[model samples]
Target: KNIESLFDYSAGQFEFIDHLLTMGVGVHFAALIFFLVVSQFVAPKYRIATALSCIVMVSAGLILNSQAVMWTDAYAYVDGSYQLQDLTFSNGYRYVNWMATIPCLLLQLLIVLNLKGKELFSTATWLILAAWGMIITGYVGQLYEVDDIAQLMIWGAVSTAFFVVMNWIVGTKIFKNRATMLGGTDSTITKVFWLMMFAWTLYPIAYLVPAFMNNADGVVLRQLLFTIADISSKVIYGLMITYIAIQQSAAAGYVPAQQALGRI
Candidate 1:
């Protein structure tokens, strides 16, 4: 039997994943180009950071899309749901991408936030580890069979605990102290950070979508939710970082030598 035809809309749902990946790649590539162009115009202090953030976003996007393609090939329709080697499709490749990119994401914020000293180091270290914990536990939970639903819930709860801790640090410590650390609160940066937090909150919800929903529908819902979260967290959040860097550079009167000389 053809997997595509197994359900009323399975083909469309699967095709949606491919489309999401295509759009995600395009958004990340555009962001990279935008950042590279803006970096040349920004202050020297910000040039390296903005350029590197762009590179990380592009790399993450590409890797995630590649993983999606691999996942499509690795799983097959079985028992009304996609599965691989007796395990339901878990999109484990995303955990690998998250482990690499989540740190980069936090580091970008810390750079713009100007966090330094033990506070910066400790926060970055813990947050990165927390991100890893969230994704890894969720991945393991997803890999379990339906009979092990209790085990799945346990890991899910563990992942949620890490998520809460990470959010607590950001909300209570980082955001609260932004004024003292950065001299004054930059509303744009603050808004962007909150946006990232909101997007991140969706990840855990998406993680558990499969556990409660019917298997056939869960497959599509999980992919759709995860894809949206990825775009929000990576491409949208990265562009906001670029916006802050450009604004800060402008405020400091930092311009490329060519631009300062009125050269094209």
Candidate 2:
């Protein structure tokens, strides 16, 4: 009954449609315009840091996906039935759905800033490009072999690796020199960061608790668990990303303690 209401008869179709919706695409597009108009007057440090923050967000996306998959598996046993698989696969697509628009976001940001001149390309530009390429290629591969779990795994692995590598490359190579001057240490950024960390706490509960609930006459618990898993993955996950985006936008230029805040 609950699933029917949430997913409707077109549950599968809803997944496809949901993927097209992205706050990042719209919000980042607006950010691009704002940055372009203000470039003439905003401090160069703020400009550079904001650009780097955008890159960092992209990199973090990779880590988030990979972590979701692994954590889903790690906490795989609780009641008995292997429902984590359903939760992981079902909600996982929401991440995949947003993949198509990332390249445009990166290009717009870089083009607006004219990052090609100062070697910002070496940092965020290349990372976003490679990550997006992997994401697109993986999605295409999945389309061709949708029924094969192994094939899906291979593509997913590649996409995840690309993002993780982007995170490390941006963090260590680009942000290393600027970390001291970024206001990342201040309350604003920290609050946003911790809020994300806290919200994600529910994922483990959803994964592990369902396994032990399918016992005796308590067969109904399985249904309840599925409902929880869906809400956590689709609704909760989307909200978490939105929260992060909001925080990043708010703290874009604020530097705390003379320390720069771009990519962490």
Candidate 3:
């Protein structure tokens, strides 16, 4: 059974997944309040990065909430077990969420790094293209996970190639600008970069769930990993990026960031 099919699950297993998904919504929305309120404390230029985080949170929360509802509707309790309906329930919502959020998330980093002019144009174009390459290839592969292992294998390999490219660009080229950033920001930005890198790797693992563990257990685990990964990648990642923006702001003598920091 692939991820979308019926399978055995304890009542606790089902409850845990539902609880996690709902909590995922709560996490993102909670992060949203912080992003929105904190924007006023950063420099005006950095607000765009803050805004992007807000966008990521809103989109992620919506998709998570949708999936939370979908999970309830996709199965029926019949004959004392959960049964699959003609309707579909898949991890499919996440790709859409990623599509909406990843570029914004990546760009938030680029903006914080202070790339501008031709360099900004050149880097943003290729990195975004590489991300799309990774996403579309993975999308193709997942379509085949149900009955075609070769297709899943081939497309997943191609997606991995794109993932490597994206990582290389961020690891080598993007963070190379760290030296040019304001003081105190170097370490935190490094943390964001590393956090983003490692948290993203979780997705490919979750993607492979149907291949190895295609039971209800696998589905639950996949969602669990996804929830944890999303919190770290988006909420934690966004907050660190926010810190960088504010740090840069304060270094430039922006008063609000200084005032905010003074409270600490």
Candidate 4:
């Protein structure tokens, strides 16, 4: 009886689930291509970092799509009220995915900047911890019921603060200092840095969905928005970095030694 209830799905819901599954498969395949084939052409200096970022990105996509499927079994409607059958429906997996990938994204940037020594390790450590802090707090916020609005807001504020600090560090320390190294003021790398910041700003808006609209519709919308944000942050941003790597390699007259190995 419980199994039937959990598996039961309306037509519209099935369509949504199908779409999520398709996208998950698409991203996973794309990430593999980037890591295996596309990354071979990337400059030697950036090859390892780019590959790692794509791998982590693949992990995020898998986790997200699995969460969508789990949603069907995780929650149900009773008397027009939403109730969780298990804690897995809490959307904590999404944040757990973020905790892993966000740092990889940051490392791609730091590597492109050619940061070294204490500054490199310190900046990477701080940004990774901050990213973890932001997502863990978000996970906590989502784990609670609607009545816990105050607690949710408190965590949201903390996450936002961490986000701000992340931006500050990137802007002042990384972007500003590495302006010339990244091909001058209007360079591709510089533009990518700004683009990442813009994409990241949308996350907090998505995070506030539960606070402003705590309903089934809001939950779906939040997932969609978050999916878009994740694609922008991870896929789009990482590709831009790959582009930068290629351009930098060409400028430096560095030819990829593994090109034939990958192509043949």
Candidate 5:
């Protein structure tokens, strides 16, 4: 008799995940080039945001590369399906990656909002700390998820609490701040806030996927959600920030931004 796959992943299912993970790597690296190039066209004050965007791309891209390797090594193709291999697939790298990117991404937003003095200092400091708390709790929660449902729910609730604070800062405080900046929460950047909300919301759903499905398909679906969220939050979100910088720069008569953005 042929061997049965440990996780019941057929070639199609395995390759679906393989393709998605590889695509994530490709997306981030390409975004790195785009951000690096376009940073030159934005205002001097906004250049740091673009640079942070580049860092996000590199950090995320490399982690996705590592995940791809882990996925390949975690299972072996045999008899039209995958079987468990020596290496275990791990999601641990993601927490570490998020720890780096999430704070930076939020900081990018604050910079674009042009907060200065103590206002910028306090908000960034609080939200960035909350960002770390959010991810760290989720990291520990997920680890407990396999062995203890109570621990999963407990830590998940703690993590969700951190997310609540972070959300309020971005949604309430930052949004109100935006109302005083470039068009008062009624501009293209408003759309970016909604986009950020959408992508950020999906992570918690993906984190709970194992609680609901706990299967090979759920694994694949989780990766899909993560990759999608990553691109949306990092690349697309970063581009929108860059766009804001260009708009602001051109409005202020920065010649490069005006020339590049056709504001003249």
Candidate 6:
């Protein structure tokens, strides 16, 4: 009875995907929050690194996923007939997708390679590989038609699998070694890191839930879901990048607080 309420198994096989989507959102949200809280108590330096890793994973997923959406061949099931419609790519939206992903990839690379301890190499390397894998798989989906929702879904699955693995690495390998490297007192960096982490953690909720709910069988609905998810992800990303920039500036001998002294 409980299972039936959560999932209408009798409806159709397609409905099973909805169940998975709902569960995916829930798992990612819960895991991100728990990890973000735990990261705060960890070494200050590692805090931003951990957050950045999640950012990269998300960015890679979005970039490839957006590209898939862009190249996706549009079709509709009308009157028991399948008709091919207009292409989704070849517009300004393509540029928007690129803009959303590029900086995230750049910053994620920088943080993982430069900011964290040498001991973090193992975990960081795994995340880097996973990000690249997501990017590759997404591009593969683009080579085919976009109406092939199964292919697009495969890309999402690849990215999500890597993300789950990364969560484990951070929880085990990276968190365990936090104490020795990050012995510094809380500063603007720590504050900024915490703030950015909060913003990053809110992203899946702001986007994924709606996509799952709007599982309508039309190109228009799919595109709308993509747009909403992209906008929310990028807005949070901009704030996070600013947080990182301020911290980096402070570290380079600039007074971040002084610049905003009058405003606050």
TM-score head-to-head 3 vs 5, winner = 3
- Span of ten consecutive residues with least summed lDDT in model 5: 1-10
lDDT for model 2 comes to 0.38
Flag clash pairs in model 3. Answer: none
* Candidate 1 lDDT for residue 89: 34
RMSD of each: 4.7, 12.6, 1.4, 4.9, 3.5, 12.2
TM-score of every prediction relative to native: 0.81, 0.37, 0.95, 0.82, 0.93, 0.41
Candidate 2, 201-228: lDDT as tens digits: 3332322222333232222232234334
lDDT of 6 by residue, 183-216 (tens): 1322323333344334333432322322344322
Best by lDDT: 3
What are the lDDT figures for the candidates, one per model?
A: 0.68, 0.38, 0.85, 0.68, 0.82, 0.40
lDDT order, best first, reads: 3, 5, 1, 4, 6, 2
Query: What lDDT score goes with residue 150 in model 4?
Result: 75
Which has the better lDDT: candidate 1, or candidate 6?
Answer: 1
lDDT of 4: 0.68
Candidate 1, which segments miss by more than 4 Å at Cα? 1-9, 71-90, 180-185, 257-264
Over the stretch 95-188, how does candidate 5's per-residue lDDT look in tens digits?
8889888989998888878887799899989998999999999998888656775677788899999998898888776557676555232387
TM-score of 5: 0.93
Error of 1 at 93 (Å): 0.9
Residue-by-residue lDDT tens digits, candidate 1, 1-264: 112222333455666766777777777787778777767776666565586678687777787668566656655666665545432234666777778888888777776676667988898899888888888887788666354767778998998888888777666655665664321337776787688778988777766665677455666676677778877887788777766666666566665523533553
Deviation from truth (RMSD, Å), model 4: 4.9
For model 4, how does the per-residue alpha-carbon lDDT over 21-140 read when each residue is reduced to its tens digit? 568658855766776666767677767667866776678768866776676566566545444565445456667778778888888788777677898899999988888887887777
Candidate 2: misplaced stretches above 4 Å?
1-117, 180-264
